Amino acid sequence: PLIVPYNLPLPGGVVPRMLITILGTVKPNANRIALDFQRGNDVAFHFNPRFNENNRRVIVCNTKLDNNWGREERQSVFPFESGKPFKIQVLVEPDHFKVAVNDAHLLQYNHRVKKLNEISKLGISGDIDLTSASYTMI
Numbered sequence: 001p002l003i004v005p006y007n008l009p010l011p012g013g014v015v016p017r018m019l020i021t022i023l024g025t026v027k028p029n030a031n032r033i034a035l036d037f038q039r040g041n042d043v044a045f046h047f048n049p050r051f052n053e054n055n056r057r058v059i060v061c062n063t064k065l066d067n068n069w070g071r072e073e074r075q076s077v078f079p080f081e082s083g084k085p086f087k088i089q090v091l092v093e094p095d096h097f098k099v100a101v102n103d104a105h106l107l108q109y110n111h112r113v114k115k116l117n118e119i120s121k122l123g124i125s126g127d128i129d130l131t132s133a134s135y136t137m138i
């Protein structure tokens with residue numbers, strides 16, 4: 001089991017055709033998960049499943065620039081389930097991050113941070129047992 005929060009370096013940042021795979025199991029009674037693709041202190045892409053926001057389950061995505069969150073993008077399709085194993089795949093494409101969970105397309109997030117080769121860390125946080133985090137080129 002990897003330690004959470006986990007820091008996965010992305011050497012030289014990200015690039016289209018780069019596929020990031022995260023495997024884990026959601027804890028019983030989970031409240032939150034977060035993936036943070038960071039450019040230094042900025043968060044280029046925050047992917048944040050919330051298991052209980054006003055008694056609804058929602059995915060919140062955003063960007064943090066100069067310590068300020070921007071406009072959220074919200075996805076009510078919610079593929080996670082407390083207690084169950086999951087796979088998150090984040091495929092970097094030219095205009096967006098494309099996210100699939102358990103081999104089903106979930107959402108795309110347009111690139112707000114444009115210096116892809118500076119987005120050189122992925123943080124993984126929240127209410128999971130983390131099994132593996134890796135990347136490959138497809």
Ligand SMILES: Cc1ccc(S[C@@H]2O[C@H](CO)[C@H](O)[C@H](n3cc(-c4cc(F)c(F)c(F)c4)nn3)[C@H]2O)cc1
Pocket residue numbers: 032033034046048060061062069070072125126127
């Ligand atoms: C003006 C204003 C006021 C409130 C807000 S709320 C805010 O909303 C953001 C998206 O817009 C992020 O989700 C933020 N956030 C979540 C997490 C986090 C950290 C963890 F360790 C986790 F394990 C985890 F799953 C999640 N860290 N930071 C959240 O605080 C926004 C603007």
Ligand SMILES: [Cl-]
Pocket residue numbers: 032048050
């Ligand atoms: Cl949260």
